[PDB]
Design a protein around this ligand. Sequence first.
Ligand code: HEM
Ligand code: HEM
Ligand code: HEM
Ligand code: HEM
Lengths: 146, 146, 141, 141
Amino acid sequence: VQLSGEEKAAVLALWDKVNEEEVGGEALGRLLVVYPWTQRFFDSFGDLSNPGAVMGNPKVKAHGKKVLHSFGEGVHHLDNLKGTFAALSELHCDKLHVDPENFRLLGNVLVVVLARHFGKDFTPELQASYQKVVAGVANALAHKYH
Amino acid sequence: VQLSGEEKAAVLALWDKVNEEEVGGEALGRLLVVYPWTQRFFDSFGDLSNPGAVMGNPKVKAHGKKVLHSFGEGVHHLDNLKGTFAALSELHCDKLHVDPENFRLLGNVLVVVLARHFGKDFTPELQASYQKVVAGVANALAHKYH
Amino acid sequence: VLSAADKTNVKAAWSKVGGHAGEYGAEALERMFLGFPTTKTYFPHFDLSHGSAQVKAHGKKVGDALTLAVGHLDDLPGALSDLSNLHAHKLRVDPVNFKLLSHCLLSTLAVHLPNDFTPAVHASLDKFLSSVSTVLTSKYR
Amino acid sequence: VLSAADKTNVKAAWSKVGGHAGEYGAEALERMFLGFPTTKTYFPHFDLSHGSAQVKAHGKKVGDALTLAVGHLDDLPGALSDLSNLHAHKLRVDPVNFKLLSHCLLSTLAVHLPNDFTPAVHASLDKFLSSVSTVLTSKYR
Ligand code: HEM
Ligand code: HEM
Ligand code: HEM
Ligand code: HEM
C-alpha cells in the first residue's frame, strides 16, 4: 500500500484505540444486515433473519473479532499485505468461493463503523488513508482469484 | 495468469486468427455505444453521439487497433502481465484517471466480439480461458491504483 | 422499464431467438459455470457436466422466463415477482452473479446471431438484462 | 421506490439531519475527493481545497436535492428528472462514482449522528442512496 509516513503513523495511532471486539462485532453485523445475500455464507450461525437477531448473535460478535484481528495484522504489516493474507485468500477463494466484491463491501462497512465510533476524529484525511488500507486488504484477499 | 498448457495453446491458436483492426475497431466502438459514460474520455475523436457515427469513426477504428495490439502482447506474455502493462497502467491511472471497473467492461466486450466473430469455434471452454486472460489484463492495468 | 426504442429492439431481437431460447439458456449456463466457477456453488444438486440433462432442463426454464419478460416489458416487477422471491429471499444469490449470467447470455447470442447482434441491439439487450437483474434482486433493495 | 418500512426510516433519519443537509453534503464531497481522487476530474473549475467556498456552495445544492428526494420517495424519476439529464447526458458521470459518493455520505452521517445511525437506518439509507443513484444514471439504462 502506497501511504506516506505521516499517513502510516496516523493509521497506526487510530488502531491503538480500536476495540477489535466491539468494532468487529458491529462491522460483521452491519454487513449481514445491509447486504443480505452475505448471510448465505453464515448459515451455521443460526438466526440472522432480523437486525436484532444479527446484532446480538454471539457467533457474529466472536467471528467479527476474528476478522478485525486479521485486519489489525494488516495494519501492522502494510508492506506485505499479500504475504499476510495468503492463507485467508486460499480459504475465502478456494474453500468458500466468496466473490471478491464482498471484500470491498466489508472494508467500506468497517470504514463506516470507524466513523461512527471516532466521530470528528475520523477526519476526511484519516478516512482517505483508511480507504487505501481497506483497498489493500481487499486486493490481498482477492489474490488467489487472479 | 493461472492457465494450463492446453488452455494456453488454445488461446494462442485463436489469436493467430484475430484481425486486430477489425476486432479492435468493433470492441472499442461497442464499448462506446453500450457504456455511454466511456465517451467522456474520447472527446477528441469528434462525433460519438450515435451508433453509426461511433462504428464508422476512423479514430475509433485506429485506436481500437492499438488496444487490440497491446492485448495481443499480453496474450503472448501471460507470464508477466504486470511487466507488460506497467506503462499503460501509469497512463490510464495517473494521466487519465479511468476507473478500473471500465477495464473489466472492455475485456468483456472483447470477449463478446470474439464470440461474434468465431461462432461455434468460440467454445464455452475457450471462452473460459479468455475470461482468465481478460481478467489478468484488467488486473495488470489496475496495478498503479493499488 | 426501458425506452421505447429499447423495447422495440428487444422484441425484435427475441423474435430472432425464436424457439432457441431454451437451447441458448442452457448454453449461457454452461459458459457461466466454466467461465465463473464461483457460480457452481448454487447448484450442488446439479450434474454440471456438459450435456447434463438438468442444465438442459434448467436452460429451458431460464429461456421461458426471459421470453415471459420480453412479453411484459412494461411490468417486469409483476411478471417476475415469483422469481424475485426465490432468487433474493430463498436462494440469496449474490447480485454480482446476475452480471455474469447476463454476460454469458450476450456471449451466446453473439455466437448464434452474429448478423442480428448489432451494436444497437447489443446495447438494448444489455439494458434489458440489467432490468431483469434489478427485479430479481429487488428483494435486496 | 423503496419498501414502506424503508420509507419510514429514511424520512425519520432525514428529520434528524434537519438543517445540516448542506454541511453534510459539503463534507461528503470533501471525503470523496480525498478518498477517491479519480472523482476530482469532474471538477476542474472547482477550488477543491478544504473550506473551498465552491465545495461549500456545492454541498448545499447536494443536500437540497437529497432533501427534495426524501420528499418525493414515490416519484424519484419525476422529482430528479433534471439532475438525471445533467449527470448522465451532459456530464457523463461514470456510474461507479455514485457508489463512492453514497459511501462518503453514509460515512458523514455516521460521524455526526452516531446514536441515530443504527443498522436498520443504515440499511434503509443505503437503499435510498442506491435508488437516487439509479435515477441519476437512468439516462444510461
Ligand atoms: C476484509 C475482508 C475479510 C477478512 C479480513 C476476513 C477474515 C476472516 C477470518 C480471520 C476468518 C477465520 C478463519 C480461520 O481462522 O479459520 C474468516 C472466515 C470466514 N469468512 Fe471472512 N473475512 C473477510 C471477508 C469475508 C466476506 C466478505 C465473507 C462473506 C461474504 C466472508 C466469509 C467468511 C466465512 C463464511 C468464514 C468461515 C466461518 C466459519 O465457518 O468459521 N469473509 N474470515
Ligand atoms: C483492456 C483495457 C485497455 C487496454 C489494453 C488499453 C490500451 C490502450 C493503448 C494501447 C493506448 C494507447 C497509448 C499510447 O501508446 O499512447 C490507450 C490509450 C487510451 N486509453 Fe486505453 N486501454 C484499455 C482500457 C481503456 C478504457 C476502459 C478507457 C476509457 C474508458 C481507456 C481510455 C483511453 C484513452 C482516453 C486513451 C488515450 C487516447 C488518446 O488520446 O490517444 N482505455 N489505451
Ligand atoms: C437472467 C437472470 C435469471 C433468470 C431469468 C433466472 C431464471 C430462473 C428460473 C426461471 C428458475 C426456475 C425456478 C423453479 O421454478 O424451479 C430459476 C431457478 C434458480 N436459479 Fe435462476 N435465473 C437467473 C439468474 C440466476 C443466477 C445469476 C443464479 C446463480 C448464479 C441463479 C440460480 C438459480 C438457482 C440455484 C435456481 C434453483 C434451481 C433448482 O433448484 O432446480 N439464477 N432461475
Ligand atoms: C447522490 C448523488 C448526487 C446528487 C444528489 C447530486 C446532486 C447534484 C446537484 C443538485 C447538482 C447541481 C446542478 C446545478 O444546478 O448546477 C449537481 C451538479 C454536479 N454534479 Fe452531482 N450529484 C450526485 C452525484 C454526483 C457524482 C457522483 C458526481 C461525480 C463524481 C457528480 C458531479 C457533478 C458535477 C460535475 C456537477 C456540476 C457542478 C458545477 O458545474 O457547478 N455528482 N449534482
